[PDB]
From TrEMBL, chains B, C, D:
NAD(+) binds at R11, I12, D33, R77, T120, N315. SUPFAM superfamilies: Glyceraldehyde-3-phosphate dehydrogenase-like, C-terminal domain, NAD(P)-binding Rossmann-fold domains. One of its GO terms (molecular function) is identical protein binding. NCBIfam families: GAPDH-I (TIGR01534). Keywords: Metal-binding, NAD, Nucleotide-binding, Oxidoreductase. Mg(2+) binds at I20, V23, V26. Its EC number is 1.2.1.-. It comes from the Bacteria. The lineage of its organism: Bacteria, Bacillati, Bacillota, Bacilli, Lactobacillales. The gene is gap. PROSITE patterns: GAPDH. This is Glyceraldehyde-3-phosphate dehydrogenase. Residues 2-151 form the Glyceraldehyde 3-phosphate dehydrogenase NAD(P) binding domain. It comes from Streptococcus agalactiae.
Length: 337, 334, 334, 334
């Protein structure tokens, strides 16, 4: 609990580097080994300088075998195959699989061998033989015997605590979700052939409102079984480089008022789910450690006839909120065995 | 040929002038703003979002010359003090944002003033509110002050009408993901109107903001009065917006029925598309609302349905197209 | 009427096609690109920076119907197997990138192929570089393959040439304040190219970057070889750029002389303006370069002068427009 | 502990306040602006470009509490009417933009007023204009009104001073690629100041604009008087800027010498770097100026040299860091 889990990161892209950054400020968790195929000098620079998350809090120098991050050495390997990483050499109990390739059960568990690691957390959905965990919503399902788990998506970690609070208090019949989302790496900087064939993600990301699909509301059942098949949604990608907001319009079993809804969210608040009545904007949530931040100023309960539509809304940094939730799950999972 | 005056040569005003060049039977002979003719002539010629002007503009003393024809410019702060009649001006496009009630808009009507006024915004409940090809039939021609509604109203109305006529609307909640506007601050600072969100850098944030378009839809479609509410998320595009509506309907429907209904309701004001477009693709369109079949949802859970419908609009040109159709028609029954 | 083939339907190819619709006496009868035609058709119809396609585009078997006329759209990987002569194609705009040398580009030349080729890339010593209305007099017509230079070269060249011809250039440094481009990451990440600056979010940063358009000006203006160097600052506009040249000249000058000289050098490729414009005003212009007299500076300190001289260009449509001109002309000689 | 007034709680005002929390012996006891406490308290807590406030801010009657300690807020439009003396205020940060001359700034000095004024801007040619760690030695403590110069002057001066000291400057032209600021319109509209370029949408354009910093360098470095001129290109980032200087020198140099000379001159105000950084990397820095060795060019052509040196600055936090340093020093010698 104050015990410091030694952590490996595989793939030092956006999620890896931010996971690293987050881990400096949540100790009782420590990265001793990074693995990635790109030039360590390219990697050091991108750890140091970050457009949206700011300059690194400290110092980063390239040394033989790794980095000195504020004095402390950290090993950087470039082993292509997960089977070939001697994690146990550097005390590494658990691995954050963040490449984007090794995202099934049988691929990720190649990290497990006598010189490898005990456990693995994947940064995508794993399917349905790999448990899916949003911290402080459904992390109770972990018994400790599991070899590989998933941290869900950025959108799922925002929606989950907000949806869970609606279910436990009032009961959700059905709901539709709209995420107003920062542009992401899967969009073209300028109009051009998207190698996925998506005609919308082919368009200039920082110059357009771009509608896009998302499976977060449809696959919410993996995290909250009571809402399986009850939620659907979509996204509007807009020109901010990070920071997002999720609106849920739902029909509930119980009658409610705005005040009841907000107070129920305030009472559900914890390290993962924040609360605020400050009329904030997206730039204010960049770098937060909440997985989701409910905003009471945007709540609506529309009673027309007997019938009620309820609008809820929660902010999230699709980068750092997600990262923070992932580090929370990576800590807890390593501390059961 | 009806002679039109524009009070407020801003985004809506300047673009109304641009459209009026292609409307035979309507002509602008007076502009009133707060600035010199050279500022206004420059801003007509060059437009960041809507492109270079189609023609010639040259500055003169007391006005400017658009393709040879002189148009008078004045900088009178007060509506009552504008001598519209001097220039032959019968109808005024009130496009400043400051005289958007019946009382205030009527100051334009006096001796040597104008006969009639079209507000480019909600004008309160005691002004008639016209979305062209939805409720422009309600005009007899004896009105002094009418409203052309808001931009978001002109998007939502034909879409919500189509849902009501075909299926019946129980209730509904609207989100408009909307371009930033001139009432937002370019960088964080004191908002004169007290808004803590519009005080923030408009091109660097997703900014929640309130909107009355759904709440006041009763003024355009009486049968929907009290049934719709909503809000906005202002985002970093300089123009171009989209309206999502989530609704419970009286009749059970499918995605295909809903889209076909919309296509059938299509006209000059209400577009239909199945192309998966983005906001830049609607900049400068002449529809007041462009329905997008690619974003329609119909979610059935335990026999109950939620219906999602989405229409694009250029908050600038889409509104302005509607405004000028409503002007053209209002002039011809005056 | 010159029948044209476009090998590579990326930003350039697509705009070349769009341009060619309006400068007729030049026509596109065959497009060849390995991308799914439905993606290509969609990108032709809708363009973020250059607006909607002027016309209609529908995907048909083997090609597109663009406003009535059918255009064949093949996906030949190899240049020697495109049967250009089956669609009357005289001249090929090589815009793929893969076939940028002479011997690669001239595989388009065979009995069932084309007669001539214009690469969009910079040639390899034995391929002539051509800015239209600057050095297109060097083309005798016997050449098989030529280059149309870069976007920046097409902006700089007519401005530098007028400096040389009127005054004489000793040396110079160039800075381009440039739209972000497709070789920049949308968000911070590892980049093919290795550039730690192009690895950064392009629409959220000022990003210094290297250019050789000044260093390679010798190829277009022999008198300026070795005399100009430069660099760029990529900034958050999706298209539109501006080129600043600070030069020592052989002759003493005034700001008025400099400006009237540029005005005298004006033509279809080199525009001249005295309006205080901004980048959005040059989006989609057909000039290769647009001299801005309002930014001219001549700083006399002691006996000595530094002359600052500035030009706008749509790094997209300006370069494209210059490339369709070169393409038209090179075809009409044989 | 000297007690300080801020007039204008804007970008510079609020960041100055922020920096003063960590400066022992300086303390803000009064803020004056044109709006209520809740607006100002909100804009302090939440900052788009500079992040959340480091502390607690709570609104009260007549002011707000910052980590417990109360700060009075008034809304007095005229400097002559502000009773600074009531709150112990001796020195005023004149940060509104509207009282930026010796004469206008002096209106804070009266019975019940303040003792001394620091303008957060150029204040004309009869006022001591200080760039900290370049010429703050000129302050004796008897001055009533001083200027902290402009953002761009605080960037340019240490770079130009090292060039003078080590090698001697003949003449020089400056281009600053600059963030947009609050004097630009968020969308195309009449600019109150009459500037036809600042009228344009600032987050959607490259906007040329004038700047007096280069010409006024004589106030800070007398030996460079009349030798420097420049201009700006305002571009779509909300903060962060960079200054390119092209100079002919008296001594011949190499790239290596030039960079070594900058690193020698390095201090708390003048940073030195060799990392290929971009504008977001300098947001929030405490350096007034940050030299970038990677962009140094020395071009030699026929014996003759043009030298290019480039320094970064957060027009917001870099200037403010410089301003508060000058404020801290001025207050100690008063
Ligand atoms: N831009 C949109 O998206 C949009 C859409 C629909 C409706 N509207 C409405 O249209 C109106 C104008 O909006 P806009 O976006 O064009 O704003 P804008 O700021 O571009 O235009 C306002 C213009 O009015 C001028 N002005 C202000 N006070 C004046 C006075 N007393 N006399 C004369 N001129 C004066 C200003 O100088 C400016 O040119 C508002 O009511 C707004 O709600 C705007
Ligand atoms: N922002 C920059 O990058 C920057 C850098 C260096 C210097 N400056 C200079 O600093 C000054 C302020 O710039 P800013 O960007 O902070 O502007 P800003 O618009 O953010 O702030 C101006 C503030 O002054 C207030 N104000 C206006 N008139 C007033 C009055 N009569 N009394 C009291 N308050 C009044 C406004 O409400 C606002 O809060 C200007 O002189 C500017 O040139 C700005
Ligand atoms: Mg007409
Ligand atoms: Mg203090």
């Amino acid at each position: 609990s104050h015990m410091v889990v030694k952590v490996g990161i595989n793939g030092f892209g956006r999620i890896g580097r931010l996971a690293f950054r987050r881990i400096q400020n949540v100790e009782g968790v420590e990265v001793t080994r990074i693995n990635d195929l790109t030039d360590p000098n390219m990697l050091a620079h991108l750890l140091k300088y970050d457009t949206t998350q700011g300059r690194f809090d400290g110092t980063v120098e390239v040394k033989e075998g790794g980095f000195e991050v504020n004095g402390q050495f950290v090993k950087v390997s470039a082993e292509r195959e997960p089977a070939n990483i001697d994690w146990a050499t550097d005390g590494v109990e658990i691995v954050l699989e963040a490449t984007g390739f090794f995202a099934s059960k049988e691929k990720a568990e190649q990290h497990i061998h006598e010189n490898g690691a005990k456990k693995v957390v994947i940064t995508a959905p794993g399917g349905n033989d790999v448990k899916t965990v949003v911290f402080n919503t459904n992390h109770d399902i972990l018994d400790g015997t599991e070899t590989v788990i998933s941290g869900a998506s950025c959108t799922t970690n925002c929606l989950a605590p907000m949806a869970k609070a609606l279910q436990d208090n009032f009961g959700v019949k059905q709901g539709l979700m709209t995420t107003i989302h920062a542009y992401t790496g899967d969009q073209m900087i300028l109009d051009g052939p998207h190698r996925g064939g998506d005609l919308r993600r082919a368009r200039a990301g920082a110059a357009n409102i771009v509608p896009n699909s998302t499976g977060a509301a449809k696959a919410i059942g993996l995290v909250i079984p009571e809402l399986n098949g009850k939620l659907d949604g979509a996204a509007q990608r807009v020109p901010v480089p990070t920071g997002s907001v999720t609106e849920l319009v739902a029909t509930l079993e119980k009658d409610v008022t705005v005040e009841e809804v907000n107070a129920a969210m305030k009472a559900a608040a914890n390290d993962s789910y924040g609360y605020t009545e400050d009329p904030i904007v997206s730039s204010d949530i960049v770098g937060i450690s909440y997985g989701s931040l409910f905003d009471a100023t945007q709540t609506k309960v529309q009673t027309v006839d007997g019938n009620q539509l309820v609008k809820v809304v929660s902010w999230y940094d699709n980068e750092m909120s997600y990262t923070s939730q992932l580090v929370r799950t990576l800590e807890y999972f390593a501390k059961i065995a």
